[PDB]
Amino acid sequence: PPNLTREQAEQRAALLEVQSYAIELDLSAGAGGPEVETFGSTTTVRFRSATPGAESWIDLVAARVRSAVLNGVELDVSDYDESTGIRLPELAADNELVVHADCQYTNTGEGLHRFIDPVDGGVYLYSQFETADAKRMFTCFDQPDLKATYQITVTAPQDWKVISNAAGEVTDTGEGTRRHVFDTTKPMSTYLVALVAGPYAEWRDVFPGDGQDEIPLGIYCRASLAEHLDAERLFIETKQGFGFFHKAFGVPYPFGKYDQCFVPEFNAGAMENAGCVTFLEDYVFRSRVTGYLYERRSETVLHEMAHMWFGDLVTMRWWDDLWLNESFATWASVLAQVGATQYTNAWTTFASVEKSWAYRQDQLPSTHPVAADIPDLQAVTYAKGASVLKQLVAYVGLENFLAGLKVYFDRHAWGNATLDDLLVALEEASGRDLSWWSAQWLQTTGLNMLRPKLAIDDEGRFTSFSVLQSPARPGAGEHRTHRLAIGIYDDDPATGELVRTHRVELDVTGERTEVPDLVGVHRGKLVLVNDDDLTYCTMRLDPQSLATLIDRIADIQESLPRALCWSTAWEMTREAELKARDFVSLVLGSSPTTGIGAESEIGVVQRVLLQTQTALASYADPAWQPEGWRRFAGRLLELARAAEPGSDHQLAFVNSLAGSVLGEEQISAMRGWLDGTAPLEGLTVDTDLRWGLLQALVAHGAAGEAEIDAELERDQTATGRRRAERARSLIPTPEAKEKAWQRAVHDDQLPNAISDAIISGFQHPGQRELLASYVRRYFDEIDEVWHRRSSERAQPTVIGLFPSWAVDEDTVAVADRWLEGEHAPALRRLVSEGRAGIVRALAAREFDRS
Numbered sequence: 001p002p003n004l005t006r007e008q009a010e011q012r013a014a015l016l017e018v019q020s021y022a023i024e025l026d027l028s029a030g031a032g033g034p035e036v037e038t039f040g041s042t043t044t045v046r047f048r049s050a051t052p053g054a055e056s057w058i059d060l061v062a063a064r065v066r067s068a069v070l071n072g073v074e075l076d077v078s079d080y081d082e083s084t085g086i087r088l089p090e091l092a093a094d095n096e097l098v099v100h101a102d103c104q105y106t107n108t109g110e111g112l113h114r115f116i117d118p119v120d121g122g123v124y125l126y127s128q129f130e131t132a133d134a135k136r137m138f139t140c141f142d143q144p145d146l147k148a149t150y151q152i153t154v155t156a157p158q159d160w161k162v163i164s165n166a167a168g169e170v171t172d173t174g175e176g177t178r179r180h181v182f183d184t185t186k187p188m189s190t191y192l193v194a195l196v197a198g199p200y201a202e203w204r205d206v207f208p209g210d211g212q213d214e215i216p217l218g219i220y221c222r223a224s225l226a227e228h229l230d231a232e233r234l235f236i237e238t239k240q241g242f243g244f245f246h247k248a249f250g251v252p253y254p255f256g257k258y259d260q261c262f263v264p265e266f267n268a269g270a271m272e273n274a275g276c277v278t279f280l281e282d283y284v285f286r287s288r289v290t291g292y293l294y295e296r297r298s299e300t301v302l303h304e305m306a307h308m309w310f311g312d313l314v315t316m317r318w319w320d321d322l323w324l325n326e327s328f329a330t331w332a333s334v335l336a337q338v339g340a341t342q343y344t345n346a347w348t349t350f351a352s353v354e355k356s357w358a359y360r361q362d363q364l365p366s367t368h369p370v371a372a373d374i375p376d377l378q379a380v381t382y383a384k385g386a387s388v389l390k391q392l393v394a395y396v397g398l399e400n401f402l403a404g405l406k407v408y409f410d411r412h413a414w415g416n417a418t419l420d421d422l423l424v425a426l427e428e429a430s431g432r433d434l435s436w437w438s439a440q441w442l443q444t445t446g447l448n449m450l451r452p453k454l455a456i457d458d459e460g461r462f463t464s465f466s467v468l469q470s471p472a473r474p475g476a477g478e479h480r481t482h483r484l485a486i487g488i489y490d491d492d493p494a495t496g497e498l499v500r501t502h503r504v505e506l507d508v509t510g511e512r513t514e515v516p517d518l519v520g521v522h523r524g525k526l527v528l529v530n531d532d533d534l535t536y537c538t539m540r541l542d543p544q545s546l547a548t549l550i551d552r553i554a555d556i557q558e559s560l561p562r563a564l565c566w567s568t569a570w571e572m573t574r575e576a577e578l579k580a581r582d583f584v585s586l587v588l589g590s591s592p593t594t595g596i597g598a599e600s601e602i603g604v605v606q607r608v609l610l611q612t613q614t615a616l617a618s619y620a621d622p623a624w625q626p627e628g629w630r631r632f633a634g635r636l637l638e639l640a641r642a643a644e645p646g647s648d649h650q651l652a653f654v655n656s657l658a659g660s661v662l663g664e665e666q667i668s669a670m671r672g673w674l675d676g677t678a679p680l681e682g683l684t685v686d687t688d689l690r691w692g693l694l695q696a697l698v699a700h701g702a703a704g705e706a707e708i709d710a711e712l713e714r715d716q717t718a719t720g721r722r723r724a725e726r727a728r729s730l731i732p733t734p735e736a737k738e739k740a741w742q743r744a745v746h747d748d749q750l751p752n753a754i755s756d757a758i759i760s761g762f763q764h765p766g767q768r769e770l771l772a773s774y775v776r777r778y779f780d781e782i783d784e785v786w787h788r789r790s791s792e793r794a795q796p797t798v799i800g801l802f803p804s805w806a807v808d809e810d811t812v813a814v815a816d817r818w819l820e821g822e823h824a825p826a827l828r829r830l831v832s833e834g835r836a837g838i839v840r841a842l843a844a845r846e847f848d849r850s
């Protein structure tokens with residue numbers, strides 16, 4: 001495929017201005033077997049040239065270009081190649097080009113994807129075009145700053161539904177096909193054009209008119225999955241977003257209708273094609289899941305909806321602004337979740353999941369500025385981008401930020417814009433100087449630590465208060481400007497819980513900033529210098545506040561300050577400032593009202609329990625790890641047993657046990673729940689919980705390959721196959737690890753997700769000794785894997801098999817010795833990242849036994 005460079009795109013954009021595409025797709029052969037390889041694609045493009053007589057090109061990736069006709073002249077396409085496209089010599093002022101080609105389906109979710117379903121034989125298609133794979137379906141100037149209208153017409157097998165960006169009309173052809181004529185779209189970038197086609201099950205709803213017109217809504221999924229799709233709940237959350245964004249952005253939904261389609265083998269998660277959003281099928285839940293998965297699905301639904309304005313109505317000029325596109329949609333989705341849905345605690349989720357991913361990534365040796373240069377198409381973090389964007393909102397002011405956004409949307413509608421265009425609208429709205437701001441926040445790496453320096457009188461009121469900021473590390477050590485809030489918490493007189501008794505908001509700059517507003521204010525029991533989680537930083541506490549956190553974290557009433565305390569404790573553990581055994585004690589608590597057992601936010605419970613298992617396996621001193629896991633598994637069994645029957649908390653406690661190093665008593669209890677002899681009342685032991693408990697029994701030698709085979713026969717599905725592959729990898733024998741290693745490293749015929757699933761069961765915290773010999777085999781065999789497989793398939797093998805299990809200096813020495821060699825750069829990067837994790841675990845283990 002072509003590697004369109006930025007300069008090439010700029011040259012073409014200076015020259016051309018595209019009015020309209022008329023696309024005709026002949027998919028009548030699309031319902032056959034695996035051999036069907038191509039479909040008919042006719043494109044008519046009307047565009048203008050600013051220099052008559054000039055030359056330019058148009059992109060297309062097809063097997064055969066049958067006909068190309070520019071302004072009525074037949075072009076020579078005998079020498080056509082996918083990488084070169086079609087040359088357009090001797091351009092006129094106004095041009096019309098007609099191309100007839102044969103484009104091919106894909107098995108990679110690049111371009112037009114084709115997939116066939118076993119349950120019923122159904123054949124399902126969908127487009128994935130971001131970044132520049134629109135050219136695999138139609139002839140186009142495939143770059144985001146040459147917007148055009150599209151009129152799409154598809155002839156399809158008569159039982160297929162067809163969905164596109166715009167609404168359409170269907171006509172029976174009398175030849176076993178139907179013809180789908182879609183309205184001309186509003187102007188949009190090529191990467192946002194959509195086609196979804198197959199025997200999809202359909203549900204319909206409508207969002208009523210609110211200056212915003214009525215919006216027709218649809219939801220589509222594979223026929224085989226329709227029984228599991230909770231369409232009513234998806235439509236409620238969809239309607240909640242459309243009532244929110246118009247008011248927040250001041251601009252009504254820009255397109256006519258809104259379809260959301262769940263599609264098979266989706267690599268991308270979700271994709272904001274205008275009026276036709278595509279979703280990964282993991283968002284259709286076949287088993288009982290906790291409320292956190294529903295929340296995360298709602299966030300992604302609103303993420304893609306926000307892109308209808310930011311991304312689709314106004315689009316980046318070039319892909320170096322991809323970060324901003326995603327970052328904004330992340331912020332806007334959480335804004336909408338809190339403002340419009342049942343997920344009112346969604347900033348707690350952002351602080352605990354998104355921010356903690358941002359920090360971890362920022363502190364890697366691979367760290368880079370949020371706004372990287374993108375010179376080409378293969379040159380194409382977001383967590384940090386989202387985090388930094390939230391701080392940009394705080395610094396500008398929310399009210400000013402939204403006011404600037406309406407200005408931006410109005411000014412650039414149906415057109416393109418850059419980061420600088422946004423920053424200018426936000427400067428005009430706020431009075432701030434954002435030139436300085438980007439240089440400090442978007443072109444730098446690393447984190448500042450923020451902590452209070454305080455003094456109190458006899459009555460407990462502040463006599464002085466400042467915020468201390470450390471240099472940005474890893475990076476250039478600059479001090480940033482932060483708009484933050486300082487929160488003071490103290491006992492509630494009616495309940496005894498810790499509640500907020502003061503907040504002040506202020507600009508923090510430099511190494512130290514005094515807060516005169518706090519002089520005379522009672523210091524309470526807990527001071528948070530990043531209260532409301534406004535800025536991106538490493539927050540630290542004064543001595544008394546840290547003691548209160550350790551003693552009474554479960555007592556904090558509001559979920560966001562409580563989550564910020566869980567985050568602080570965790571990031572202190574990662575950084576070797578809090579002992580891994582002290583994090584574990586804090587999490588496990590001593591009573592029904594302390595520690596994570598008293599945490600009401602189910603997303604926090606799951607995340608904190610995961611981090612605790614990281615602290616035990618990776619950060620606890622090896623001499624103490626057996627006792628730590630004895631404490632963890634016993635506390636979790638007691639929490640699962642005490643939990644309310646059928647509740648999310650009960651399920652989360654059982655799921656955490658399934659990932660743990662377990663003693664006999666836990667194994668016996670778990671066997672009883674799986675086979676029914678001694679069930680946990682209320683616990684729904686459905687298909688995916690069965691796999692979870694079976695995998696745990698397998699990992700501890702309590703179930704053999706017979707039982708894996710038995711569970712696979714009761715769950716003969718693609719998902720079941722993957723969970724069965726993980727279980728076979730988990731078998732704690734040298735023979736099973738050798739087979740799994742060989743299959744993951746050397747079998748390229750196996751499908752991608754099956755290779756993924758094999759690797760996912762290679763590691764287990766109770767099997768460290770079994771895997772010792774694979775530290776050396778990793779570094780001996782990684783170059784061969786990188787050479788043999790493509791980078792997309794090699795990367796998950798390299799990341800997933802890195803021996804993060806072996807926390808030892810010998811592992812660092814083998815990684816060091818490998819780094820001394822000549823290896824591909826991208827591969828050195830991944831080994832560097834894995835090496836850094838082990839270094840960090842060694843420092844934590846050193847601190848823990850101290």
Ligand SMILES: [Zn+2]
Nearest residue numbers: 303325326329
């Ligand atoms: Zn996005």
